[PDB]
């Protein structure tokens, strides 16, 4: 992941952890080979296991999953009906 994408993920930290729905997201992430299944189990157990803690670990770990991790992640957002969040992200990448 390039520095600009990483920086984007940090800038949107608050919004991501506040709004990301994860339970519905795992299938999408798998389909696009963003994470291996055990990686997902680890993220699921991050911290207290709340939605927020999972979300946070997801987006941190996301930075390590490749050059195209960010656009692929936006797509998974789209695929799971999180258009608003995906929209917030995209309009930054472009910005």
């Amino acid at each position: 992941m390039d520095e600009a994408d990483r920086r984007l993920l940090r800038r949107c930290r608050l919004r991501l952890v506040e709004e990301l729905q994860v339970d519905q997201l795992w299938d999408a992430l798998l389909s696009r080979e963003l994470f291996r299944p055990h990686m997902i189990e680890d993220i699921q157990r991050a911290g207290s296991g709340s939605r927020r803690d999972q979300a946070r670990q997801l987006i941190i770990d996301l930075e390590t999953r490749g050059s195209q991790a960010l656009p692929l992640f936006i797509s998974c957002l789209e695929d799971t009906g999180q258009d608003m969040l995906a929209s917030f992200l995209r309009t930054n990448r472009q910005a």
Binding site: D23, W26, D27, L30, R36, P37, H38, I40, E41, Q44
Partner: protein, 95 residues
């Protein structure tokens, strides 16, 4: 799955539930494509290791031959030598 397989699984169920740490099995099965994320989230919501294992078994009970093989291969691969031995004679044909 074939009756031989289901029956073998039912016969050795308690042993299976006592020992299985699901986090080391569900990953393989998800990789293999014979367990759903939704099923995995259901398992994960059980508070103890044995309850997790129990749920997992119920789910596998209702599944197909390829699944039993997936499960068995996971058990064997994760060093559950004894448990794998119990299911061995129950393995069915696959293509």
């Amino acid at each position: 799955m074939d009756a031989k397989a289901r029956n073998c699984l039912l016969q050795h169920r308690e042993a299976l539930e006592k020992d299985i740490k699901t986090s080391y099995i569900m990953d393989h099965m998800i990789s293999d494509g014979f367990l759903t994320i939704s099923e995995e989230e259901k398992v994960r919501n059980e508070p103890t290791q044995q309850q997790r294992a129990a749920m997992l078994i119920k789910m596998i009970l209702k599944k197909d031959n390829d699944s039993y093989v997936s499960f068995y291969n996971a058990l064997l691969h994760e060093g559950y030598k004894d448990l794998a031995a119990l299911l061995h004679d129950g393995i069915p044909v696959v293509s």
